[model samples]
Target chain A: MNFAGKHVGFGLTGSHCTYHEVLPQMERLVELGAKVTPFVTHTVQTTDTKFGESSEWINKIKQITEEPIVDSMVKAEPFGPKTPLDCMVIAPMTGNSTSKFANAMTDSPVLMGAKATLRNGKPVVVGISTNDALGLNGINIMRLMATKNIYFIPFGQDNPQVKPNSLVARMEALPETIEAALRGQQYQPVLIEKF
Target chain B: MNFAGKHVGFGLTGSHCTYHEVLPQMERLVELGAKVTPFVTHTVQTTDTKFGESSEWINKIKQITEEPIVDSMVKAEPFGPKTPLDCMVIAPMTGNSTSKFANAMTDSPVLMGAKATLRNGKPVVVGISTNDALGLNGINIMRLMATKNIYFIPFGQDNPQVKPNSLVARMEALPETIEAALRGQQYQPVLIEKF
Candidate 1:
């Protein structure tokens, strides 16, 4: 269920940004000029009780797509050089996904993509803030990414229209975070060759 | 040089998102599925001045080979609905470039791509940002795009590793921005879609 070497690897959870939103984006990204692969967080699917239930849902989607789907079932181990994944983004990233990310929980597609990007020294931008516990977990990883020099854009939510929040006001704080990221302090968390 | 209608446009700005940083991104996006026609942004090229009169700056790049470096002046325009550009990215966007973008100032290649994308209603992602006055102008327009439902990501200089900031950020931001862009708001920006 994992793919190595695709240009954009999406970490999809069973949440808001699903087939409805993702497919078109996939098609367009391809149309515009890049190849996209998905790292679906089969979080629920990994759960024994949830696995069977998740299968039906996955089946419905799979029945519809002729293109390749990189669910936890797509089985190629990620390439170490990671030339295929230039920069990775966990779009519409959810709370459970983030927590798992911070805890190093390799239960699903989403977490795996995150772990791979982190391990490879790539950028990981997670856009969501769950309640206290998950937030703490997500933050721990955010700090890790920051320290590693991996670019991280931890927004409270992916969209205000879909899930409006005061995240926008608090959003400026993130742009500043990114500003520092751009400046090079974050990357000092790890060493890299100067471009 | 303006092109619209399904044409995949690459916004070439020269902030921290270096050409090298973005070149592979551009390539990956292409692999992701974009039908692109190298849309150039002169944001970095114009502001950096160091690139002034030196065409070799482009020669040293290991990626971005897809650009083809054709003499656009001689290429006939690609037009109409079928011609909608697959995508357009203005990365490493600079303050000076923002000026042109703000006022439709077409002094640069990125602006020229913007002018074309704006009119086409195709996917357009401006994944660049700055802190100076021009940066503010770019911000103003980005807000407009938000309202217009144009897909855009305002990458800032705050990210430390993204230093001097153009090349890398743009390289990183493009994929997600393109994803959001084509998701085009259920309602389009009046000034843009209607005007």
Candidate 2:
């Protein structure tokens, strides 16, 4: 019901949130207050090359956890808001991740996770990847995510787009977010369409 | 500082949250676990005759326990995500109420309060007021809000839009019919310019 006391499914798609600086800190998140369940549909291996078809990397992840990594499409299909996640953080998002989530694109598992979290009335923190400019529509993407209960933290020249406040903010709201999800308190039901 | 121990400012806009349900259940939320500081607002008042605004009535809300009902807009702003207002509900929103919040068109206390909550990355629940087909871009207004961190609930459904599974998707994740506000977490802080 409420995801507060439940396990958190961390979805990653090789964006910034999947980096050394970010990933290691995830352990800290788990230690502080969370049962981290990392799910992967893509990884750094797929970044420079064509979509890497390696379940080995995925399998390695399986060694760490047993929960299935939901597909991007499945995440969107009827489950957008069907289920709830305590919080899903997509770090190192290039402008692409931000746009994908904002536009409601479900091309990858990470995007689908973001969509599902919102659909399920959960909280999401998307840290945009910044190898280049944020693009003209970058802000618009951020605006869209803001509406969906998603938290978009920005990076500065000195550091990555991080919400230091979230250290406490996310933790504080976790209970409310999860309780809202469990009791089915705060969410809007949508019409189910058939293919 | 985390809002966990801080006081959250809950502003009651012209919504059913204050009337139909949220008000009666305010105590339940507190008991269920939330430190909401509820406040009354007049922005949900009647001005738009084209839409249904006659039901815009105000009544003296009893102060439940020691949770002081602060004056809207003037006294303070909604709790920030860093100091998030434990919880906020702007339920039973009318069409005009949606307009004011979307564009920040009014100088009412509710609008000010909503703006403060959103700017701080706090969660705000906004219900729609559409009885029939939405205006040219009224739904877009909601889309914009969803991008801002406001979760939206279904509205004006004599029947029901999302039943059973939908449970209630966040506003940003709500479909076109019963949409929610923009994702707040995705808020991209930056310079903005008109097209």
Candidate 3:
């Protein structure tokens, strides 16, 4: 689908390992002609793991979207009323941010962006990357699933043998998820087998 | 039902206005002969509002249970494995805490204690006192209702005309809720009219 005039807000929480999978999808949105604005959590801006460095990831996002990154709560608030987004997409959403978002606890810019989208009665698509999705955090995921104006990118257990509770989205399906979410629908077969 | 040999964990979140109604229930639990342990959030320890001063409320809770308040996360953790509770109850749970608890975001001592109880397959009785109970937080309340080992005290819209989104628990039903929760069941008629 052509996303020529659509304004999509792309938010990244700190799942550094999944950044490799998610960032390419961000690029894909831009390539498909969607005006993508980026948002990040403090953890995403500060933490550097074996996957990559903070600066590297930030620069990569800047080069792909070519838009100013929303890195602070003060900067993120305007998206609610001043500059609303058509659809908000949170990829590689950590268990921490997933819990916070489902609870309406907006501590990070990524969450604030999603909250803004929800406030405007727009769709917010989430692609979870958490190990506890089927554990204590299971209810939170189900809560979001049942809430209005929310959608999920198709996801499933990535490693059921060792990390039995871990679930990750098929990042390749991001574009389709956003396309469906824009039309007030969730992409079908939301629960998938990733492994 | 006799609570003579049961060890109950009674937690109070920051809904200062409901303290008068809730404190009496605490005394009731102790009078029922349960070994009552108290837990509180930082807001309960620091915030002073028109309802009462922090010290006054703290002293009242102290007087009711005659047990040292578990006021920090570190102290609350032991209730999970080391010293498990027969049942955990959170009275007058504020919207913020309710949202956090439902999403498994255990930042406060009260939440940690509840988490500990859940970790051990014990019951948690929640008494919600939130104005946003039917708004953005509605999903959270429902989510907890569907989750395992979680039960609610009878609650309903306190002022549907003025505060249409508000729901308050019938604090008088605390003991009955706990008794049923201890037996692995929710009290019948879990929904009630308060106003």
DockQ (CA atoms), all models: 0.01, 0.46, 0.17
Tens digits of lDDT, candidate 2, A1-195: 223355566665553333444454444445456665564555335455555565444555445555555554654344355456666666555555556666667687777676666666566665444443234544544464345455544333322254221111122233333334343233221111111
The candidate scoring highest on TM-score is: 3
Interface RMSD of each: 13.6, 2.7, 4.1
Clashes (N, CA, C under 3 Å) per candidate: 75, 63, 0
Name the 10 consecutive residues with the lowest summed lDDT in model 3 chain A. Answer: A43-52
Q: Which candidate is the best by lDDT?
A: 3
Tens-digit lDDT string for candidate 3 (A121-163): 9999999977567866887899999999999999999877655
Please write out the lDDT profile of model 1 over residues A1-195, one tens digit for every residue. 122333655555645434454444444444444455555654334444643455454554454444355566333146224333544545445556655665667676566665666676655544443333112342344333434545444332224344322121122233233334434433221211111
Ordering by TM-score? 3, 2, 1
| Lowest summed lDDT window (length 10), candidate 2 chain A | A186-195
Q: What is the TM-score of chain A in candidate 1?
A: 0.54
Candidate 2 residue-wise lDDT, B17-127, digit = tens:
436444544444444345666656643343544454444322324454366555545554534333445335554455556666665564666555666675654556654
Error of 3 at B24 (Å): 0.4
Which candidate's DockQ is highest? 2
Off by over 4 Å in 1: A1-161, A164-195, B1-7, B15-17, B41-57, B60-83, B133-135, B138-142, B147-149, B154-170, B185-195
Docking class of 1: incorrect
TM-score winner between 2 and 3, please give it.
Answer: 3
